[PDB]
Amino acid sequence: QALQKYSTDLTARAREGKLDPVIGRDNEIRRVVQVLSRRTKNNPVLIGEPGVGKTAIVEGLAQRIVAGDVPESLRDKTIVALDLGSMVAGSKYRGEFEERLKAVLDDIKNSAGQIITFIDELHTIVGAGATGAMDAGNMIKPMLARGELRLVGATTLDEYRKHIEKDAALERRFQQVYVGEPSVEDTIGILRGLKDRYEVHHGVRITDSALVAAATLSDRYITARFLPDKAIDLVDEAASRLRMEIDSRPVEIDEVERLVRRLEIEEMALSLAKLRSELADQKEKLAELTTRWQNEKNAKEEVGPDDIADVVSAWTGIPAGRLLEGETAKLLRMEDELGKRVIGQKAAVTAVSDAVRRSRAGVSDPNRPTGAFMFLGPTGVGKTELAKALADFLFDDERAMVRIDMSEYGEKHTVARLIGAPPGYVGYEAGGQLTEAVRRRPYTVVLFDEIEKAHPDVFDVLLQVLDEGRLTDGHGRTVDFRNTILILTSNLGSGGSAEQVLAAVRATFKPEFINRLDDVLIFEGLNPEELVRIVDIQLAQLGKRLAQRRLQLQVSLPAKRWLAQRGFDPVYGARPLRRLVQQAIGDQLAKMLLAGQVHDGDTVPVNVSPDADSL
Amino acid sequence: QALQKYSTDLTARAREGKLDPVIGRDNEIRRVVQVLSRRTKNNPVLIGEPGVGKTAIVEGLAQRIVAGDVPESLRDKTIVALDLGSMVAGSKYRGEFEERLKAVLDDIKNSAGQIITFIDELHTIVGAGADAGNMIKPMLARGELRLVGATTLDEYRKHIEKDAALERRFQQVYVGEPSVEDTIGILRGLKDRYEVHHGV
Amino acid sequence: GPTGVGKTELAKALADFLFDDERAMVRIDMSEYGEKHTVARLIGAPPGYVGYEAGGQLTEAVRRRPYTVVLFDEIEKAHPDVFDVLLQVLDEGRLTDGHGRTVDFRNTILILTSNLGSGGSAEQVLAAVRATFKPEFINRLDDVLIFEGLNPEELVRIVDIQLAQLGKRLAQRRLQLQVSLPAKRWLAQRGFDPVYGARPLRRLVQQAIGDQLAKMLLAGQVHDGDTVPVNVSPDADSL
Amino acid sequence: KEEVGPDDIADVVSAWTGIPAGRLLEGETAKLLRMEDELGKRVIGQKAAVTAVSDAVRRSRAGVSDPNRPTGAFMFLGPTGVGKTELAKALADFLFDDERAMVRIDMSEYGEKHTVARLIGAPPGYVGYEAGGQLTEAVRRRPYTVVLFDEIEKAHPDVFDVLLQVLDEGRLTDGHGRTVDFRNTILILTSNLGSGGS
Amino acid sequence: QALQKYSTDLTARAREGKLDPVIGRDNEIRRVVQVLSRRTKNNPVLIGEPGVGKTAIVEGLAQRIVAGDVPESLRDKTIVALDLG
């Protein structure tokens, strides 16, 4: 009678239909029924990596027992789920748990071959009762050998060689049933049967296109779990996305209302102007949308394959939408928009814009990095400027990329600072400097500065990165560089030719490494015309830096071409101009400013006095 | 008489205004809520680098619950702040942590759905074993206790992620650092209490 | 043999009808075992050290299911000390771990790729093996194979599968594309290099078609249901 | 002014963490102009090599300089016994009132190629790992020091590849992966090339 | 009031006259009072060599309280010495 008090039941809960319908997996149910009817030692252990369905199999067996596809031996058995957790409730005396478990075993034995026990997560049955001296968990050990209790269990694969293989007298008493995960085509069949329980809990409608999308779209992106269920959660979270909008009123409008309320708060607290404008603008927008809303009303209720993509975009934030109206105007105005920071070198900006546009269009290959290439030329041209320029509109940031340098790697053994240390050695919890920093938010751009100065041993670690985008650290976690962007910089062949530098690449490298790369983009020198448009940007940039004390400048054309005509080196590139500006302006304004008389406010002109320039 | 001698109540703590008036973070609230109201496996974890406001998100959620702005199936959910650091208090025995935890789980699942939980620093959900901290694993993958947590990022890849049967139960709301101008908006939001406590 | 030939596409193809998967093999990589102490990540630590209840990365992946084909990629770049670990794998069938539980490689398939020589016909590329591998490691192996280059007759048909594969990538958008025979015989003319194999052709396919298809696909005016043709405007591949 | 102001915030962020920034409140600016002729009271000689050093400190504390560069990277050379180290130590005297804030590291130690790792550390799995590096742990505390690279000719051409990325970025990494930032330090590296020519 | 038979008190004893001379060290008290009146962080720890008189610092703080020199926003506090054995 203690089974009423210590155990649950899974057959009474099966006659009420309060379990989920179990679809597929005929072979494992047949294997469990095959094992669970032999003469002695009839008790299986379901083993598999977590997620594959091991609790689903036992509930499907309960469904079959109530249904009647069972053999004639297993008729009317009434699976009872024990608890080795809730049976050590109050047992601080030296004999209570022992007789309690003995009373449960005599209650099972006192019923003539009916009860199928079910102990879930049986790796915690070994050290159940600690008597200071092993005397608990080896009370069922003489009983399983004759096979009087049937004992269905389900333990994780890597929880099995930690507790049971440690204590291997018991491991022979159990038969093992391995469970592997299905493929995509069976997940498509599973998801169409669970589209009967999420329509009731959430009163919505679900398109089959969402199922055939999410069964495949989460086979590339969320590469951290296993898949009978990693496609279920996207469906349920998209249903909640829809239910949040079927209730009282939509979303953006909510976004804008909260935002303008915030800016209102801030502004009134300050009473900054500024925000005053951005308020008004945001009030225009929120007005327009509102009207549009009404209009529409005057004139959807189901989920589709776009909401699945938006949910996957909202988590492991790789953008994966249809590219609907948000960035297509920026994706077309992208080559010339990137030309507000890089002057000239059109053939490289085109080859970067191409590799971004074909990635977001969804034309490229699911197992290769989205773009991994190496541009090189002379010094002071803008090869680090371009890599910091395209990390500015993917993110609206400047520092989310992972910039490492290979000028530290002048020796053979330093490779281990980016791959972790093997087990048994000092830094083992720390992992790798690289691999522990890309597994979080896998969309950042990666640079490898100065590939020349590295010793020829780090070249053979990137050799598997560029083609099959996996990498393995010290633990064993396969990180994926599937949809990052890899950029190599160099300095080979500063003034030779367009083919003397191309014969210089092949000397230091091998054919196995040049073949992995995309187009090796040669950078040219500069032009005296194209230098002029550099100078303006310099005189914009410092022109913002003095805005904090609200000084600015009124610079005329003769000074602005005087800066261009001097400091023109075809060798050193556009780097001496950033010294010439602060020699001509910075020391003069430093002497004049901090002795008073250049008060915040009045902007001072500059003009040339025949050699130099003065205020 | 079980969950009133161990765990406090943030909702009763917000009936007067004894919190901090959070400003901003729209996507984090609008992600935490529409994970907290699904059917199965419905417990988020606020993973963030330390010192970014992972507690102020939950307090803002509490104020949004009390002021009546949340969606329909969250009417007055009365979120509770458990603390497992005070439940391993009196125990030099066998089986004393088990009953003390079981009374709390039974008083949560014994009522209806109004015991949305909150454990801060759930990296210490693993310890105090001896097999313990393991009555909760069948409970989490059935959607009963809603268990909103928040841990630092370095502890999470040191304790929990080794034990992937656990971290298959939690979702991951990620919280990143703000920019400069939005921090200025935060600071102009909090120009209320610092001028009252210090009278300048 | 040389590069860009098919020495990994072969080993990912006999794991495709024995299993009907492509992830069901143990693809570990010996491009990272540059030093003498990277042996320990696949055999475990001796008992008493930090990671002891973790097992090997090799021993605790065959002991689960002892049937999967296993590769070893770029056997040059490993230090000449992992070869002596791989030695008793062959010709005995077992190794041990920290716990001493032996695992059995009786019925796997070990496949060893390489990039040796790159320019000997058959004599010199087999004369470069003997300087690097000892006479007790060549002796353990089966047929040491040599891969030939690529005839220009072969490189035609490759293009077929390439375009066929691209067709099965464009089924979600329901966009079908019609390739003419002049555009199909044009790619083998432009993309033949007897040094780099057939990998530079798979940049030529995405520079010919992909550069302008990615622009036409997201600017509007091309939608599902189209049979987009490619035909040789006298140099490029105009749509 | 009886309430708080943005000059008390300067004192809070200045006394704590040890960076003398602000807006040049009065008391040091009169000393800041009397600095070239002040430096000519230990460094005698060198009329035209003091003003370039003056036009780094007065250019940097005046708030007109790039936020991502060190505030000085100049190098100087010539004959021996002219007082290079003496000028560097007088410069360290002027803005610390001390002598041990300067971080002198040798360059006559580095003839061998493997001896570079004193100023980086060791990768994870090697002998000195919990310690770190000389030149990194020296600057993780006291982040306002002047650093000295005495006689950088004797260093064979692979040490030059390390401090190549100290310059132009203002960052450095070590064994743990913690980027230390040299954004507000003086870098002075003395040489001995030439010695007789023009 | 029920723990004072199980704990101690150096506020009611601070008006007895059992307190030591507070000669010297009248800047660290200002540092501790500056730490103590904040919104966060208001739990200082005195870090130094043992056997110097950190206990005497806290006794001098209590002796300053019982006559009154800290501001009125920390007026009439009660300080409890804890029984660490």
Ligand SMILES: Nc1ncnc2c1ncn2[C@@H]1O[C@H](COP(=O)(O)OP(=O)(O)OP(O)(O)=S)[C@@H](O)[C@H]1O
């Ligand atoms: N073959 C299947 N048929 C029906 N439902 C399934 C199937 N596989 C998985 N599911 C459902 O998908 C989810 C998978 O979660 P579970 O299988 O219960 O987790 P589990 O199998 O217990 O693994 P762990 O390690 O115990 S968390 C549940 O909601 C199942 O009902």
Ligand SMILES: Nc1ncnc2c1ncn2[C@@H]1O[C@H](COP(=O)(O)OP(=O)(O)OP(O)(O)=S)[C@@H](O)[C@H]1O
């Ligand atoms: N075309 C250009 N457009 C804008 N800024 C430029 C251009 N060319 C040079 N510059 C500037 O000059 C510097 C060159 O940028 P970098 O790319 O960092 O130098 P580099 O080309 O990387 O050469 P190294 O060898 O890496 S120092 C930066 O400060 C740029 O702002």
Ligand SMILES: Nc1ncnc2c1ncn2[C@@H]1O[C@H](COP(=O)(O)OP(=O)(O)OP(O)(O)=S)[C@@H](O)[C@H]1O
């Ligand atoms: N958006 C915000 N609104 C109001 N206060 C905020 C906001 N963001 C941060 N804070 C304040 O910043 C501090 C951070 O508090 P916590 O959230 O507890 O810190 P944390 O992010 O949890 O990191 P730890 O683990 O607590 S050190 C508190 O004083 C908050 O009031």
Ligand SMILES: Nc1ncnc2c1ncn2[C@@H]1O[C@H](COP(=O)(O)OP(=O)(O)OP(O)(O)=S)[C@@H](O)[C@H]1O
């Ligand atoms: N003979 C071939 N038949 C079919 N596909 C081929 C052939 N040769 C090359 N390929 C394709 O070329 C691409 C790369 O070939 P891989 O075999 O991966 O390179 P590899 O032969 O392994 O040489 P390495 O040394 O590993 S770089 C894949 O898309 C292959 O399908």
Ligand SMILES: Nc1ncnc2c1ncn2[C@@H]1O[C@H](COP(=O)(O)OP(=O)(O)OP(O)(O)=S)[C@@H](O)[C@H]1O
């Ligand atoms: N311009 C000067 N004014 C005052 N004293 C000087 C001057 N130049 C040199 N001295 C003195 O001469 C000594 C050598 O000067 P330093 O500049 O320290 O030599 P140094 O820099 O070590 O030269 P090298 O090339 O590195 S061996 C110092 O101890 C100074 O006191």
Ligand SMILES: Nc1ncnc2c1ncn2[C@@H]1O[C@H](COP(=O)(O)OP(=O)(O)O)[C@@H](O)[C@H]1O
């Ligand atoms: N300002 C002071 N006035 C009186 N006694 C002091 C003073 N400073 C230190 N002492 C002496 O030091 C002792 C207290 O030291 P304490 O702070 O307890 O050091 P610790 O905590 O390391 O034991 C007292 O017995 C006292 O005689």
